[PDB]
Design a protein around this ligand. Structure first.
Ligand SMILES: CCCCCCCC/C=C\CCCCCCCC(=O)OC[C@H](COP(=O)(O)OCCN)OC(=O)CCCCCCC/C=C\CCCCCCCC
Ligand SMILES: CCCCCCCC/C=C\CCCCCCCC(=O)OC[C@H](COP(=O)(O)OCCN)OC(=O)CCCCCCC/C=C\CCCCCCCC
Ligand code: HEC
Ligand code: HEM
Ligand code: HEM
Ligand SMILES: COC(=O)CNC(=O)CCC/C=C\NC(=O)c1ccc(Cc2ccc(I)cc2)cc1
Ligand SMILES: CCCCCCCCO[C@@H]1O[C@H](CO)[C@@H](O)[C@H](O)[C@H]1O
Ligand SMILES: CCCCCCCCO[C@@H]1O[C@H](CO)[C@@H](O)[C@H](O)[C@H]1O
Lengths: 100, 379, 49, 241, 59, 49, 79, 67, 54
């Protein structure tokens, strides 16, 4: 219902990866699937993800965050990878079940 | 050719693992403990030899040799102090070095981690034997209780112990062979430390944000060599402050009484770094249970890597996990305290609980919160 | 140890079937006022007090 | 006795992290040991030479050590012979072995007092109160024959007869030999006896704290100095457009 | 300017930089020791054997 | 283009002696370094002792 | 053993920084330093302290309850 | 014949309220117990409570008067 | 072993006489040393002759 939806928004501001300018999928741990996905990213979307991180890293090193006005907002967060990933995973799931 | 820092089959190493080593531009201070632990080891070994050069492993002279070393050897006393406490400072450092790993999930670097565990296990063992050398009342009764632990295994039980003591009860043969053990083990630590670090260098260091760092790395030198020399001096101050201003704070005084195989002291406590274990062993009222609970109380570390369920690597971005993490820490603090206390109410029940909660936070609350968390990000 | 009757009987009347090592106070001693044993806690070896 | 009374915290002249022992109260404490305790209590890890430069002069110690006959040998026939004491001997045992001592103190063993100060929870604070605190058993407490009451001692039944009482001896420096005045000096001695370094230990400590203060700061600079470059750094993402 | 004169005749040539830390430390020790010894012997007046010494040192 | 690019403002972090874009930074160097080098040199003495 | 150069593919990023000798040891200790030292403390004390405090309590109780059980209850001697 | 500053201050302190309050509790315990045989009770506790408060006090001053 | 003049000698004999197979264990150590030096010696000569020293 509109609970999980008002919950998710909270948690999102809670994790606070926005304070660093990082999109939801910027903080993803890079296992084999993700790796694969990231390689399928359109030239730009990747060069962009890149900056964001090299910038976040620069922050964590300085110990500071972004001024309030530059933070990502729960609804303006672009899940630029989620689709490519579910495909990688979908693809893999196949190869696996087919080898029997 | 060109420079003699990349082609020298030796010099290349100090330069390939200590200078040009690529490091996340952002690792914190919880990454420092690595070195300290190393400096800690090499340092113990020095005071260690210096000491061993005056000790005499033999029940009838063990105690007295340590005193003679303190009283008659030039700066001997100091040299003991530094060694005796270095052990603590050591365990301290190692403890954070482990927490650092838990929080930021360095444990995903399985090999680098597992070795770590082995290392811990060895340090633990090492200190055990060292402690017995001064042949004090604890030394004895400690040596007597700890080894006896293996007598919990059935069949090869009672029998395994015999080798240990080298007798039918703790006596000289035990002492002397412990001295051998103690003299040897450190070096093994230094050895495995090499594997530990060597495994780490295939992957590079992890980092507080839990995301790729290739996008920006910096030469260990002078960025972290400097960061570390400082870290060392910030930790070195308290440790010296104790070993110079309150030598016996952390140390039980009962061990100032020559071992007496006939009287086990009334107020028996192991040195601080073994209390949590102690508490757990004492929590279960069964020879075997206590042992097992103990065995797993540490052996569980091997599992942490397979109990990771969060889609992210570090806790930095998982408040829930975080709270659960600090709950675990504190949980541990208690267990320790409990070990410091006798077997009586309320303590017994408090102990029992804390243990249950320890094991539970690791085996069930972390994997469970971890999953939940993902679904709250919409993954 | 020299046990008084103030104790010798007390140790005779106790559910002998609910120990961990089922035994009667009579199979361990020859004459009750004298209990004798090897002071070694079976747990892990300390001298019981 | 599931219950126990803990001692208080006297402000020993040397308690402070920069406070040296009272080298005078120590010289006295000694006398107290030599003239009272050394009849039941051994001091195996201390020796007359240790006194030199700390409480007595070289000449004094020689004489001090000569007031005792020690067992050296064998000679040329193979006989053990007595001889006067040298600065190199340790303080004489009052008994030839624990078996003996026990027998001459009612089965009780008066423990060597070299490390005693560090072997009892409370240290000089405890040793003081045990000495002074001797008293009568409260209502309902029967102390076995040969044992005296002492609330400070665990079990309250101590096999040591109250060792001190005003004027029991007389300090050569002209000091009021009151019960406590002694118990203060002897407890102070035990400390020195238990960790002679004490002084040089705290002196270094100071020095350490001073270097450690200076050096830690000096490095906080050089760590930042170098790091500045990465902290001040600024980056921007400038795509093609 | 001291710092300039400093940087010129000392901290510049790596050779003399070192030569300074050496002759430098030297003084530092000599001096430091004295201070600490003094700050210490002072905080413990009349309690050190060095103070009691004359009451038995027949002279 | 490589023309629409300029070094941002590092005044917040600049050392006072080189904050004015019209004074040679070469006069006030001898000092800026002699100092940081003095900290360094000293630390080295502290260590040595 | 070389890792510098084979790391990752980065495009269009400009970075500027200044010699250490040109910038300050530690700057804005008050206009920037402290005010951030705080923020951090603030944001984290609510995840950390709780369980620690939680322990403290439990410690005192356990301890206080134990010292309490050592004292004697008159109701056993008023007979 | 001289006076050990100890017994002099041990006196003085036994006047502090804390002391008397506990001193009395004991006086009373001592009584009920001494006048009854086939007991169990002991006046250790009460005593300690006393000695505790007393001596603690002795501790703050005693050393001023000692050399 | 027990490194201490007054027991050094005796410990080695106790080790030989009372330790299970101790005696053998010493022998092996005692001579291994030689075998060791022997080997090393040829290992050097081998080097000299075939100029491995280059
Ligand atoms: C084990 C035996 C028992 C020994 C007891 C251990 C001693 C107890 C002292 C507690 C240690 C003090 C820690 C207080 C630090 C408070 C703090 O700053 O926490 C918040 C801070 C926030 O960081 P980020 O989320 O990454 O922020 C990004 C940048 N803005 O978290 C951290 O510093 C990381 C946590 C590392 C500390 C771990 C140390 C605890 C030690 C316990 C050992 C636990 C492991 C299990 C051992 C099994 C045997
Ligand atoms: C009486 C006393 C006599 C003492 C005799 C000892 C003499 C030793 C002096 C050695 C000469 C030092 C000179 C080094 C020259 C190298 C150099 O270039 O500078 C240092 C160089 C830095 O480079 P720059 O600052 O850019 O210099 C540029 C020069 N134009 O290296 C450094 O960072 C040095 C400072 C690091 C100190 C690290 C030590 C910290 C550790 C503390 C623990 C305490 C010590 C315990 C030691 C135990 C040993 C078993
Ligand atoms: C009459 C022999 C005698 C003399 C002389 C004597 N003691 Fe003792 N002392 C004993 C005995 C006996 C014990 C052991 C008590 C026991 O364990 O039952 C003892 C024990 C001690 C203990 C404490 C033991 C414990 O377990 O806490 C201390 C401390 C001590 N003596 C100090 C002194 C001091 C100080 C002096 C000299 C000023 C002194 N004694 C003189 C007989 C004596
Ligand atoms: C003598 C034992 C040990 C020493 C001297 C030692 C030393 C080091 C060093 C030098 C580092 C690199 C720097 C750092 O990250 O701190 C390192 C990394 C690491 N060690 Fe240890 N270690 C020891 C024990 C352990 C233990 C007991 C564990 C935990 C079971 C462990 C787990 C790790 C891990 C996970 C890393 C990765 C660091 C990262 O996350 O980047 N180490 N260790
Ligand atoms: C692996 C790191 C080390 C640790 C963790 C360690 C720890 C300890 C401990 C717990 C003790 C008892 C200290 C005490 O009496 O309070 C001790 C004693 C001793 N250790 Fe070590 N030690 C280490 C390495 C060594 C080494 C490398 C040697 C030399 C081979 C050595 C030689 C001694 C000696 C001579 C003693 C007995 C004398 C004494 O107790 O002071 N130790 N050590
Ligand atoms: C530093 O040494 C010590 O603290 C040893 N001394 C004592 O424990 C003194 C008291 C002796 C009595 C009980 N000890 C225990 O029950 C005890 C139980 C577990 C441990 C941890 C440990 C296990 C194996 C191993 I291998 C090592 C450790 C340590 C101690
Ligand atoms: C001198 C400091 C040593 C730190 C310990 C880390 C080791 O590990 C690495 O493996 C590579 C491949 O074999 C080698 O070429 C590197 O030199 C070595 O450091
Ligand atoms: C001429 C060379 C003389 C060497 C004498 C070595 C004696 C060491 O003398 C030392 O002096 C220190 C003074 O600060 C004291 O603190 C030490 O306790 C003492 O051992």
């Amino acid at each position: 219902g509109r609970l999980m939806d008002r919950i998710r928004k909270w948690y999102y501001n809670a994790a606070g990866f926005n304070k660093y300018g990082l999109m939801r999928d910027d903080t993803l741990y890079e296992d084999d699937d993700v790796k694969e996905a990231l390689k399928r990213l359109p030239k730009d979307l990747y060069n962009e993800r890149m900056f964001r991180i090299k910038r976040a890293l620069d922050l964590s090193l300085k110990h500071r965050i972004l001024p309030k006005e530059q933070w990502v907002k729960y609804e303006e967060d672009k899940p630029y990878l989620e689709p490519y990933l579910k495909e990688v995973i979908r693809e893999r799931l196949e190869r696996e079940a087919w080898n029997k | 050719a060109p420079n003699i820092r990349k082609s020298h089959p030796l010099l290349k190493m100090i330069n390939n693992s200590l200078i040009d080593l690529p490091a996340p531009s952002n690792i914190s201070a919880w990454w420092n403990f690595g070195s300290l632990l190393a400096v800690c080891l090499m340092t113990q070994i020095l005071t260690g030899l210096l000491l061993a050069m005056h000790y005499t492993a033999d029940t009838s002279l063990a105690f007295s040799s340590v005193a003679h070393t303190c009283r008659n050897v030039q700066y001997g006393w100091l040299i003991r102090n530094l060694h005796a406490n270095g052990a603590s400072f050591f365990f301290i450092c190692i403890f954070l070095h482990i927490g650092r790993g838990l929080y930021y999930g360095s444990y995903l670097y399985k090999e680098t981690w597992n070795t770590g565990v082995i290392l811990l296990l060895t340090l633990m063992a090492t200190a055990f034997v060292g402690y017995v050398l001064p042949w004090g009342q604890m030394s004895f009764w400690g040596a007597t209780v700890i080894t006896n632990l293996f007598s919990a295994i059935p069949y090869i039980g009672h029998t395994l112990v015999e080798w240990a003591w080298g007798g039918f009860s703790v006596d000289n043969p035990t002492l002397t062979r412990f001295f051998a053990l103690h003299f040897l083990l450190p070096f093994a630590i230094a050895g495995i430390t090499i594997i530990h670090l060597t495994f780490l260098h295939e992957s590079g260091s992890n980092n507080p944000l839990g995301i790729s760092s290739d996008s920006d790395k910096i030469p260990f030198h002078p960025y972290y060599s400097f960061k570390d020399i400082l870290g060392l001096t910030l930790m070195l101050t308290p440790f010296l402050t104790l070993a110079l201003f309150s030598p016996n704070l952390l140390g039980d005084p009962e061990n100032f009484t020559p071992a007496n195989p006939l009287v086990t002291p009334p107020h028996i406590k192991p040195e601080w770094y073994f209390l949590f274990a102690y508490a757990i062993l004492r929590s279960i009222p069964n020879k075997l249970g206590g042992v097992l609970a103990l065995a797993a109380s540490v052996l569980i570390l091997f599992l942490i890597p397979f109990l990771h369920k969060s889609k992210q690597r570090t806790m930095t971005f998982r408040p829930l996990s975080q709270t659960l993490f600090w709950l675990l820490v504190a949980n541990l603090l208690i267990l320790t305290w409990i070990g410091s206390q006798p077997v009586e109410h309320p303590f017994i029940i408090i102990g029992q609980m804390a243990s249950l909660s320890y094991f539970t936070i690791l085996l069930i609350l972390f994997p469970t919160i971890g999953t939940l968390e993902n679904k709250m990000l919409n993954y | 140890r020299h046990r008084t009757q103030a104790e010798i009987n007390q140790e005779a009347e106790v559910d002998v079937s609910k120990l961990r090592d089922p035994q009667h106070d009579l199979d361990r001693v020859k004459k009750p006022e004298w209990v004798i044993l090897v002071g070694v806690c079976t747990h892990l070896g300390c001298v019981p007090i | 006795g599931e219950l126990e009374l803990h001692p208080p915290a006297f402000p020993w002249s040397h308690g402070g992290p920069l406070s040296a022992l009272d080298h005078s109260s120590v010289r006295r404490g000694f006398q107290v040991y030599k003239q009272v305790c050394s009849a039941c209590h051994s001091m195996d890890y201390v020796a007359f030479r240790n006194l030199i430069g700390v409480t007595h002069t070289e000449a004094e110690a020689k004489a001090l050590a000569e007031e005792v006959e020690v067992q050296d040998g064998p000679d040329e026939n193979g006989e053990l012979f007595m001889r006067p004491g040298k600065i190199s001997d340790y303080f004489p045992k009052p008994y030839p072995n624990p078996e003996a001592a026990r027998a001459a103190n009612n089965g009780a063993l008066p423990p060597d007092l070299s490390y005693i100060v560090n072997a009892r929870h409370g240290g000089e604070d405890y040793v003081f109160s045990l000495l002074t605190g001797y008293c009568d058993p409260p209502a309902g407490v029967v102390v076995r024959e040969g044992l005296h009451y002492n609330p400070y001692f665990p079990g309250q039944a101590i096999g040591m007869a109250p060792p001190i009482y005003n004027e029991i001896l007389e300090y050569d420096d002209g000091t009021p030999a009151t019960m406590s005045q002694i118990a203060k000096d002897v407890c102070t001695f035990l400390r020195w006896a238990a960790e002679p370094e004490h002084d040089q230990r705290k002196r270094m400590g100071l020095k350490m704290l001073l270097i450690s203060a200076l050096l830690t700061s000096l490095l906080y600079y050089m760590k930042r100095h170098k790091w500045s470059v990465l902290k001040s750094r600024k980056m921007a993402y400038r795509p093609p457009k | 300017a001291l710092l300039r004169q400093a940087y010129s005749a000392l901290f510049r040539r790596t050779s003399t930089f070192a030569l300074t830390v050496v002759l430098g430390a030297v003084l530092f020790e000599r001096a430091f020791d004295q201070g600490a010894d003094a700050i210490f012997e002072h905080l413990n007046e009349g309690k050190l054997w060095k103070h009691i010494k004359h009451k038995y040192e027949a002279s | 283009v490589h023309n629409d690019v300029t070094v941002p403002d590092f005044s917040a972090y600049r050392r006072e002696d080189v904050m004015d874009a019209t004074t040679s930074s070469q006069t006030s160097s001898e000092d800026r370094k002699g100092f940081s080098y003095l900290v360094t040199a000293t630390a080295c003495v502290a260590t040595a002792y | 053993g070389i890792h510098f150069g084979n790391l990752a593919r980065v495009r269009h990023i400009i970075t500027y920084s200044l010699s250490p000798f040109e910038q300050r040891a530690i700057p804005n200790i008050f206009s920037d330093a402290l005010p951030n030292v705080w923020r951090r403390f603030s944001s984290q004390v609510f995840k950390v302290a709780p369980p620690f405090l939680g322990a403290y309590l439990l410690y005192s109780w356990g301890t206080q309850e134990f010292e309490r059980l050592k004292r004697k209850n008159p109701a056993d001697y008023e007979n | 014949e001289l006076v050990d500053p100890l017994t002099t201050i041990r006196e003085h302190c036994e006047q502090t309220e804390k002391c008397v309050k506990a001193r009395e509790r004991l006086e009373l315990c001592d009584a009920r117990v001494s006048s009854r045989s086939h007991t169990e009770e002991q006046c250790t506790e009460e005593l300690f409570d006393f000695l505790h408060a007393r001596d603690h006090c002795v501790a703050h001053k005693l050393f001023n008067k000692l050399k």
